[PDB]
Design a protein around this ligand. Structure first.
Ligand code: THP
Ligand code: CA
Length: 129
């Protein structure tokens, strides 16, 4: 896979962000994770975690997997990086997302993220507390 440039337009919630990609505004949904909705337990904390990560970054990148690049709602499906750190992985490592929505052929980073989830669960963090 390849990292490609993007710039932040606006934080949305734990697992969606509005970015400019190839010069066009797009909502991205993060691959292989699920954060609680803002109205659920840990939802606000997930939203804040992602917001801080993308707003503080100097360099935002997106990385598409091998399969579908947009979902049925028109959201881009990617792994998102903030100063080289994967947001998808960071959310799972902190117990603020579950590994989820693992579809065949868009699952390159599945085992990296399951390893993070096991570590967050071991530490009893957030969702796993
Ligand atoms: C992460 C992801 C979600 N989706 C779709 C499945 C879900 O459909 P439904 O809306 O019918 O439940 C929805 C979950 O996103 P949200 O967790 O953002 O609600 O997005 C994909 O199609 N591919 C994906 O990789
Ligand atoms: Ca969600």
């Amino acid at each position: 896979l390849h990292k490609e440039p993007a710039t932040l337009i606006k934080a949305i919630d734990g697992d969606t962000v509005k970015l400019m990609y190839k010069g066009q505004p797009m909502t991205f949904r993060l691959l292989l994770v699920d954060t609680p909705e803002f109205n659920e337990k840990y939802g606000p904390e997930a939203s804040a975690f992602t917001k801080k990560m993308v707003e503080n970054a100097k360099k935002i990148e997106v990385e598409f997997d091998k399969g579908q690049r947009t979902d049925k709602y028109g959201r881009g499906l990617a792994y998102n990086y903030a100063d080289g750190k994967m947001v998808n992985e960071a959310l799972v490592r902190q117990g603020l997302a579950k590994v989820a929505y693992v579809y065949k052929g868009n699952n390159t980073h599945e085992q990296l993220l399951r390893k993070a989830e096991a570590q967050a669960k071991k530490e009893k963090l957030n969702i796993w507390s």
